[PDB]
Amino acid sequence: MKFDPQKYRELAEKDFEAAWKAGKEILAERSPNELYPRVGFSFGKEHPLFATIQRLREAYLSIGFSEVVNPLIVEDVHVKKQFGREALAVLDRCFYLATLPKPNLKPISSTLTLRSHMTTGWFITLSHIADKLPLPIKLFSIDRCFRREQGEDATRLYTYFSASCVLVDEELSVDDGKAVAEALLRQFGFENFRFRKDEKRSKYYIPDTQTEVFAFHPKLVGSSTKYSDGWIEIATFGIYSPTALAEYDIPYPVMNLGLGVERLAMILYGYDDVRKMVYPQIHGEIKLSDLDIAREIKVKEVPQTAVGLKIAQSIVETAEKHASEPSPCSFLAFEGEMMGRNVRVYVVNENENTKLCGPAYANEVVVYKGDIYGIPKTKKWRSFFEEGVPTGIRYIDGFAYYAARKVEEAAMREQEEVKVKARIVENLSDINLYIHENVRRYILWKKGKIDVRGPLFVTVKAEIE
Amino acid sequence: MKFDPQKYRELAEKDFEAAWKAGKEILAERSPNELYPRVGFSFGKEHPLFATIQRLREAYLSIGFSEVVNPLIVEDVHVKKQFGREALAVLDRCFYLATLPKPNVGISAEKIRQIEAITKREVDSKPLQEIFHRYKKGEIDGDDLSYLIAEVLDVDDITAVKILDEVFPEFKELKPISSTLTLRSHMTTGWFITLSHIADKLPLPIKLFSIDRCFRREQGEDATRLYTYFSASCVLVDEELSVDDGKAVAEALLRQFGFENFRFRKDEKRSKYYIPDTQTEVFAFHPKLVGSSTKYSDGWIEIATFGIYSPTALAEYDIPYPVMNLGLGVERLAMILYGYDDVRKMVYPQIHGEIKLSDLDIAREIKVKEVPQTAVGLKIAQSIVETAEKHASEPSPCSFLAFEGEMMGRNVRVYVVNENENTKLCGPAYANEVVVYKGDIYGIPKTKKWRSFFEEGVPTGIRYIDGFAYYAARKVEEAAMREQEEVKVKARIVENLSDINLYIHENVRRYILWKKGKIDVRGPLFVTVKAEIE
Amino acid sequence: MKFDPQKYRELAEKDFEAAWKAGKEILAERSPNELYPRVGFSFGKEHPLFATIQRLREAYLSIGFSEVVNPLIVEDVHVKKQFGREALAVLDRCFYLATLPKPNLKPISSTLTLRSHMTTGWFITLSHIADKLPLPIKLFSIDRCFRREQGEDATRLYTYFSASCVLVDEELSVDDGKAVAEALLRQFGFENFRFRKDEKRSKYYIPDTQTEVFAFHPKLVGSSTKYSDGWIEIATFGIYSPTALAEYDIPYPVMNLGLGVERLAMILYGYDDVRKMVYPQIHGEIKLSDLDIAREIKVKEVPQTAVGLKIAQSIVETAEKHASEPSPCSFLAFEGEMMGRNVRVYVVNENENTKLCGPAYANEVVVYKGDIYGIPKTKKWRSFFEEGVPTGIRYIDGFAYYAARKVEEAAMREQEEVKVKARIVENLSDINLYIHENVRRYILWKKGKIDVRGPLFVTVKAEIE
RNA sequence: GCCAGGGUGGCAGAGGGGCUUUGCGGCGGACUCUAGAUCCGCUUUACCCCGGUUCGAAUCCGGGCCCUGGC
């Protein structure tokens, strides 16, 4: 709360520490659902695909390549202009754009196609600058592409992200393509590189230039896959055929390196199933931390009055000690008045031989590995208490508030007495605690479980007159 | 050059100032194309579009929303689930994914295929009527190097590219076949699918965003729209929602891009997927816009849209809770930020010939053709400058010793002369520099008339004589190989760079023209350099 | 609110649009302090100094230079090792580190000094790698420095940020220093560059290499300063003297370019007074947008019941039309019951000749250029309404809630009748509206003003029995 | 979407059934010239797409696009 500079200012002149301890007065008093971890900040979280993409843009920029956006929708006449006589073989794997005919039904395919890879648009973009700008030209672009490869879902998908770049100079070896791969690929951890000529020998790449980069990343050695040796084919590249360049008037050669993003994204953040990565919202993959599950566990009914708080706060204060005395046996915990009439609180196990409070009065709720447990803090549960997030809410704590608010209902209902009792704990409601219906459908979905059981055996009678 | 730390230290410890002025020995004597701005560093540059997309990402993340990738290609059945009836109206402005079928090598084109000379072009190889069926079964692109380079011999595709052209005129009959798959017009289409799988399993409120591509059809015109665009979108899932939440987000979002005031109007469309009377149009005022060659002189521009998803479409995906959806269109926001007027010219600039080199970049490309090769020549020219730079007003004729030394092991002595008379040793435009300005290369002299060019353009630092000197510096060294005895190189008038030793790579040359630039390098340089290489 | 998929699902099968409009039912109903712009998200905002710093790191990295952290605290013996015989002249402008002597009072100066510029630490850092790593070496570092230059505050400060870098090769011209300046400086807008030899001729720079970069930035032409010509000295650089390198065993030369950050930061974000930039929290410079001032303007007392809302909501609904009828004249607006007893609301200007509602019943509150106004939406105030942020809260609106909640106090106080009246409006309290005491001390600090005046002249009587 | 004038080569811009401008610029060659001029040689015989009329159309008729004096 807002204090007074002077007041405290002067107050410190006399006995300092007496005024220092006086400071504790400004601290706010917190209710049960107002303290950590039932209250916490949040924050956005980026997707591994995109992250990697940005991480790739910089990587490219860092080795000199300027960014550019290439044509995405194109007339197949281009694929044809490039692949020469192999052009049709390719047009198969590509998609075509079809539209609906205006009924002044049945889509009418057209000559347009979604690019199967960046290269389709490259020749188009390089066509306008290849002979006007000073060499070398270093362009790159990380955008979307569309392939039809078997039209699968498991192995691959309909749209991927190419991390393309092109180098336009008067003289180019396959080497420039080698350098660019290492410079680019190294900024991600890859340490050793190996290149092997590609058999596919795509016709748009000068014969015997098309290569396949193989990079080693220590993050892989030991991986639960065939990438355990540490190496993985991570990118391909070649040098555009004069046959294709000619088709677009590009006089100088051109080196073109392509990077398969979803793969890199996977290597980096360690996902195994591309789909489970790029599309986890669908593939059931969704998680909440124990700390999160925790925060979501909150007291249902809680004392709505200043006194109410100091009531249950006492109820427990006694059970924390008198939960032993051989029952029957009654103890008094509170003495004061709320709203208008004086009040006193009673605690006793009316029943015959046994103890006052059940053996579960001291069971704390903790979340662990996805499950919500109700357990005593015994040298047996340690790991659950030292690897999970202990709610901080104990059985008696959970209980108290219920009573401290239940007598609060009688205090305003004119009533004179109420006997709030509690035996077993079949779940949370029984311990006066809840979780939004959604975290619930969650726990189940993530096939986790809630084990909040226990013999509380504690009753509280209160009289207001 | 590297020096000796000890020496330079034990000498400086005693005598400092002497060591200091000595340092100059470690610097490097650069030739002519080894000087600024003939030398420089290069750096990559980002594209306004991708740039904004990044800013946009951070922006969102900075307000709670977590990133997600939504379904791009979807069954139009979804659209018809998000518009009920008004669906068709949309699917007209959408694209469907067509695709080439396989060469029907059976039935229709089989019977009449078995009534001619099946095969004449000698190829033999047992009837691979199954290796062709595995095609009408499941093949792809990287499968040609199997039924040729491993079938009818012949490497990779040296005969496969034509064997499928001459003997197989069939393939040239395939036609893409439309389907029910579509390229989402806007993000929303994919939100229902994604929110579908989690609208009730994760804790509320749900804040998700995604800046990805979307395809639309609108009068095939590069100007009045583009086939593909970007849509920085977000969805807010929570129990209780009001259009306010749409504003609150639109505010906090735009506010990180300058915009200082917002106004929201109700959209006329009144689309079906949005609750009735919630589809809002958000207008924001941004300073950079105040007074411009645009229609947003007053500063206000409509930058996004948003509304609540009808509890109707939500059910179509079994989503219990209501959901807010804001949709900032990137391309514009980018133009406003990076100052562009024409969408197409901005996003796709190389294509629209919007390339451009700077004064400084042109100046950097103007190299010196004929340049020395021996430490001597470097001095010969360096010297030819001295005598020619000083004795510029000497009523010709008249020789002038410029250099005296041994080059390549031969006594060398070159002089700066003039043949005619009634004039001066060197022409008037001998001390003319090449200044690039406003995109045109110039060969002018410093004046109170040219100031504008030397203080706005960027001087190359090369003057006609400085250019020539290097040409001569080469000739003399040449004779030092042809062991001649007398070379008298001479240059009259200047009409271009050639007549100055200067030049520029062909590409920069074409740029100049393409850009309507102009090179102006003329003037009386007149100054011969007679050499006496013994 | 959470709806039912099926219910709405089927409901749409019959008449769609009847079910569509049925959708409006899920939308939450908002109270006065719950709608825009009295509710809005917030977000961090970086400081121009730092921003520019990061923006500088990338710039450097983008031209190849790797990052490194140099020594900050150093024995003056270094300044001495470098400046040779000029070393003392320098030691003047530098600070020294002094500590308190442990009393088993008066600080005891020491031999340590806070670096006056990066160069002091450069020689130290280059000492270990200059001859072990492959050339060229390109290092950079943007860190803090300490100068004593006149020990001023106005002109300059005690600590600045140097954006240093060093280039270690076998052969180096002054040119490398020129290139690096343009490459670095261009990534910020600077278009044309001019270098002039520095007279200072610092002794640690090979004689006649020390230069001063002058860069042109169109963002300056027309500036309200001497940087109107567009050019500004933005950085200096030279080539380390063999005399100094020798002192640290560096065999090869070294080019060193230094960038004065606070200046660049200023050019970029356009601040004139460095201090008003780097330290605005102190120099009174603190702002809130009209939109912000707006959001902070909220209804004080508002209907705490479901009905209460639909009450004031009606009170206004009538004044919005009957604020004309020649007074006296009474109208009824509400008919229903709250909590338990039926209720009716009256509105009349008991007084003699005039109109029912004062001429200010339709005055909306809007914030503009820093002031909080209470004005009618007349074709005279337009600009205030089209450049500012209209609260949306009008006089009657502000009023209503007061009444609708005032009768709510009688409804629970057992009472039978209440006459809430209102004549003039001397300020906000009078219109039932407030602003946190802090935005208030703000408006004043930013010497802005609040003009919420007006003759509301509107009374409301209500009877509950 | 609606009356009407128009959509000509690197640029400007007359005419216009088929042969057909012109000026600027560039391209190549030549010049006794101390200054930014001189002469000779030059393209892709240029006039959007699909139909109609004709011996034939850039020049004549309809449909699709592009700039407007206007709604």
d(CA B20, CA B25): 10
Which has the closest alpha carbon to B395: B429, B420, B428? B420
Instruction: Pick the residue from chain C with its C-alpha nearest to A437.
Output: C2
The answer to whether some atom of strand D lies closer than 7 Å to the beta carbon of B490 is no
Instruction: Pick the residue from chain B with its C-alpha nearest to C230.
Output: B456
Helix intervals (H) in A238-393:
242-248, 261-269, 274-278, 290-295, 306-322, 382-385
d(CA A81, CA C339): 81
Residue B238: other Cβ atoms inside 10 A: 16
C250 and chain B in contact, CB less than 8 A: yes
Query: Token digits for C348?
Result: 């009349």
Task: State the amino acid at position C331 in one-letter form.
Answer: F
Beta bridge partners of A213: A195, A235
d(CA A163, CA A139): 11
For β-strands B66-67 and B206-215, DSSP reports them as parallel
d(CA B482, CA B475): 11
The answer to whether some atom of strand D lies closer than 7 Å to the beta carbon of B432 is yes
Beta bridge partners of C457: none
- Which residues are within 8 A (CB) of B247 and not within 5 positions of it... i.e. 6 or more apart? B262, B264, B280, B282, C36, C37, C40
d(CA A238, CA B393): 61
A93 and chain B in contact, CB less than 8 A: yes
d(CA A248, CA A130): 10
Which has the closest alpha carbon to B171: C39, A217, A90, A452? A90
Exposure b/e, B487-500, CB count within 10 A at least 16 = b: bebebeebeebebb
C34 and chain B in contact, CB less than 8 A: yes
The answer to whether some atom of strand D lies closer than 7 Å to the beta carbon of B221 is yes
Distance from CA of B458 to the nearest CA of C (A): 7
Whether the Cβ atoms of residue C231 and residue C215 lie closer than 8 Å to each other: yes
Strand order in the sheet with B323-329: B66-67, B206-215, B228-237, B323-329, B300-308, B280-285, B261-266
For β-strands A192-197 and A211-216, DSSP reports them as antiparallel
d(CA A230, CA A216): 5
The answer to whether some atom of strand D lies closer than 7 Å to the beta carbon of B422 is no
- B222 by Cβ neighbours in 10 Å (0-12 / 13-18 / 19+) ranks as middle
Whether the Cβ atoms of residue B360 and residue B37 lie closer than 8 Å to each other: yes
Resolution, in Å, please? 3.3
Identify the residue whose tokens are 């306010």. Answer: B244
Which has the closest alpha carbon to B72: B236, B227, B209, B212? B212
- C182 by Cβ neighbours in 10 Å (0-12 / 13-18 / 19+) ranks as buried
Strand order in the sheet with A417-420: A331-338, A341-347, A460-464, A417-420
Residue C169: other Cβ atoms inside 10 A: 16
- Which residues are within 8 A (CB) of C152 and not within 5 positions of it... i.e. 6 or more apart? none
Q: How far is CA C44 from CA A47, B205, B252, C296, in A?
A: 22, 21, 11, 18
Query: Token digits for C225?
Result: 């300063």
CA B408 to chain CA mean position, Å: 47
d(CA A454, CA A28): 34
Residue A103: other Cβ atoms inside 10 A: 7
Q: CA torsion angle for A217, A223, A225, A231 (degrees, to 10)?
A: 20
Whether the Cβ atoms of residue B63 and residue B253 lie closer than 8 Å to each other: yes
Work out the angle at residue B131's Cα, subtended by the Cα atoms of residues B125 and B134, and round it to the nearest 5 degrees. Answer: 175
Distance from CA of C262 to the nearest CA of B (A): 22
Q: CA torsion angle for A437, A438, A444, A445 (degrees, to 10)?
A: 160
Query: Token digits for A451?
Result: 């084990």
Q: Which nucleotide is nearest to B424 (CA to C1')?
A: D34
The answer to whether some atom of strand D lies closer than 7 Å to the beta carbon of B440 is no
Whether the Cβ atoms of residue C414 and residue C465 lie closer than 8 Å to each other: no
Chains A, C: CB pairs < 8 Å:
3
Which has the closest alpha carbon to C448: C364, C362, C365, C371? C371
The answer to whether some atom of strand D lies closer than 7 Å to the beta carbon of B317 is no
Coil, helix or strand for B499?
A: helix
Whether the Cβ atoms of residue B277 and residue B296 lie closer than 8 Å to each other: no
A427 annotated as ligand-binding: no
Q: How far is CA B13 from CA B20, B27, C124, C198, C206, in A?
A: 11, 21, 19, 26, 16
C72 and chain B in contact, CB less than 8 A: no
Inter-chain touch B100–A91, beta carbons under 8 Å: yes
Q: What are phi and psi of B525, to 5 degrees?
A: -90, -40
Residue A435: other Cβ atoms inside 10 A: 18
Instruction: Pick the residue from chain C with its C-alpha nearest to A43.
Output: C43
Query: Token digits for B15?
Result: 């005598």
d(CA A359, CA C309): 51
Whether the Cβ atoms of residue A109 and residue B177 lie closer than 8 Å to each other: yes
Identify the residue whose tokens are 């993530």. Answer: A446
d(CA C297, CA C126): 59
The spacing between the Cα labelled CA in B514 and the C1' in D8, in angstroms, equals 22
Q: How far apart are the first and last CA of chain B?
A: 33
D strand bases under 7 Å from protein CB: 26, 31, 33-37, 65-67
Identify the residue whose tokens are 């500004």. Answer: C232
Residue A291: other Cβ atoms inside 10 A: 13
Instruction: Pick the residue from chain C with its C-alpha nearest to B272.
Output: C20
A contact chains, 3+ CB pairs < 8 A: B, C
Whether the Cβ atoms of residue B477 and residue B408 lie closer than 8 Å to each other: yes
Beta bridge partners of C142: C163
Work out the angle at residue B36's Cα, subtended by the Cα atoms of residues B33 and B41, and round it to the nearest 5 degrees. Answer: 100
The spacing between the Cα labelled CA in B511 and the C1' in D41, in angstroms, equals 26
Q: How far is CA B6 from CA B2, C86, C243, C450, in A?
A: 12, 21, 10, 76
Whether the Cβ atoms of residue A76 and residue A111 lie closer than 8 Å to each other: yes
d(CA A261, CA A343): 70
Here the contacts of A270-278 (C-beta below 8 Å, separation 24 or greater) are A270/A219, A271/A48, A272/A224, A272/A225, A274/A156, A274/A157, A275/A153, A275/A154, A275/A157, A277/A48, A277/A49, A278/A49, A278/A157, A278/B69
Coil, helix or strand for C23?
A: helix
DSSP B61-126: HTTTPEE-----EEETTTHHHHSTTTHHHHHTSS-EEE-------SGGGTGGGSSS-S--SS---S
Whether the Cβ atoms of residue C368 and residue C358 lie closer than 8 Å to each other: no
d(CA C319, CA C332): 11
d(CA B47, CA B26): 42
Instruction: Pick the residue from chain B with its C-alpha nearest to C171.
Output: B1
Instruction: Count the alpha carbons within 13 Å of C346 in the hemisphere toward its beta carbon.
Output: 15
- Which residues are within 8 A (CB) of C10 and not within 5 positions of it... i.e. 6 or more apart? none
A-chain CB neighbours of C62 within 8 Å are 61-62
Longest dimension (CA), chain C: 102
Query: Token digits for B208?
Result: 């998700």
d(CA A184, CA A56): 8
- C108 by Cβ neighbours in 10 Å (0-12 / 13-18 / 19+) ranks as exposed
**Structural domains of chain A, with CATH:** 47-286 (3.30.930.10), 287-465 (no CATH)
- In a mutational test of the C interface, the residue from A43, A62, A441 whose CB has the highest number of chain C CBs within 10 Å is A62
The answer to whether some atom of strand D lies closer than 7 Å to the beta carbon of B528 is no
Query: Token digits for C185?
Result: 């400086």
B340 annotated as ligand-binding: no
The CA radius of gyration of chain C, in Å to the nearest whole number, is 35
C164 annotated as ligand-binding: yes
Element holding C87 (H helix, E strand):
helix C87-93
CA A313 to chain CA mean position, Å: 37
The answer to whether some atom of strand D lies closer than 7 Å to the beta carbon of B345 is no
d(CA B473, CA B531): 10
B contact chains, 3+ CB pairs < 8 A: A, C
Coil, helix or strand for B207?
A: strand
Coil, helix or strand for B184?
A: coil
Coil, helix or strand for B353?
A: coil
Whether the Cβ atoms of residue B243 and residue C31 lie closer than 8 Å to each other: no
DSSP C107-162: -EE-SEEE-SSTHHHHHHHHHTTTTTSPSPEEEEEEEEEE--GGG-SSS--SEEEE
C61 and chain A in contact, CB less than 8 A: yes
- For A362-430, the three-class secondary structure string (H helix, E strand, C coil) is CEEEEEECCEEEEEECCCCCHHHHCCCEEEEEEHHHHHHHHHHHHHHHHHCCCCCEEEECCCEECCCHH
C118 annotated as ligand-binding: yes
Exposure b/e, B181-200, CB count within 10 A at least 16 = b: bbbbbbbbbbbbbbbbbbbb
Residue A401: other Cβ atoms inside 10 A: 28
